[PDB]
Amino acid sequence: ASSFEWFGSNESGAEFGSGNIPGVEGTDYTFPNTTAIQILIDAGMNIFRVPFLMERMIPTEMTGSLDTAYFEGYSEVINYITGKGAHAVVDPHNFGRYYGTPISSTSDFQTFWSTLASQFKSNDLVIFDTNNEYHDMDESVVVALNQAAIDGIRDAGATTQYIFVEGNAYSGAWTWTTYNTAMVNLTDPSDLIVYEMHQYLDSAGSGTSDQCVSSTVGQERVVDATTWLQSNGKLGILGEFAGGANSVCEEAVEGMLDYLAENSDVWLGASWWSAGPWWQDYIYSMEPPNGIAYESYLSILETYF
């Protein structure tokens, strides 16, 4: 069958042009292309993470109502993914901020998630991702925000879906034990928490260059996090990762994923960053037919499918 339970791609677009809230569809932002998603489904991928902006989903206050247009464009892509039998990760790509302000209301954040999860409650293939890449916030608040998210999700009766929780410091795997050990104190009625981390292999780990530090940096940056999951009896998914289209980066990726496949009892899978229809020139574009990463990594990544 497989090495991992899941392996797939992020599908970007709905989170673009975040300077313009609400912005205009087709100008500031778009929704992912279902035809292009099917090409990746055809290839063997079975999980897709679809970013969006909290402010476009629920404008003005996070206790408010849905924007019907933006939600229905987003819903359309989520339900295509689950319609084909693959898991769809619902990802408010917000860095723990709302209208630019670090989120500090656990009740307004729990109300946000109740409203959102209530529209997916009976879709067993939806995955909930509490927020993309918390950073530069207090660890206590971050953990409470992940707990508030779990609480609103279940309250609304979405109890069969996995919840992806993310840590501080951009939820990096290589820094996980430095900053996010507190995240062990998270609880779920359904007991379906997966710890989602991100790892890039360039100098800063910021994922902004196509050069990797070395052919072994990828394995190096996931060891500690692998031990932490095994130690505390938790589960993980690498929700984002990428490398440049050169052999040093490719070898780093392979040895990173080798090490995670060797530890698949804690690692449930991985998700490449990123596919989507507006990436063009992007160094990590997984979008068919021409994206650089589609051209250089798809063959590589299928060996782990």
Ligand SMILES: *[C@@H]1O[C@H](CO)[C@@H](O[C@@H]2O[C@H](CO)[C@@H](O)[C@H](O)[C@H]2NC(C)=O)[C@H](O)[C@H]1NC(C)=O
């Ligand atoms: C959505 O994806 C499909 C397939 O990747 C794109 O369709 C291709 O479009 C090119 C350029 O317009 C055509 O020449 C190909 O014949 C199409 N291929 C297939 C398999 O249909 C489609 O354009 C994408 N939508 C976008 C980018 O907005």
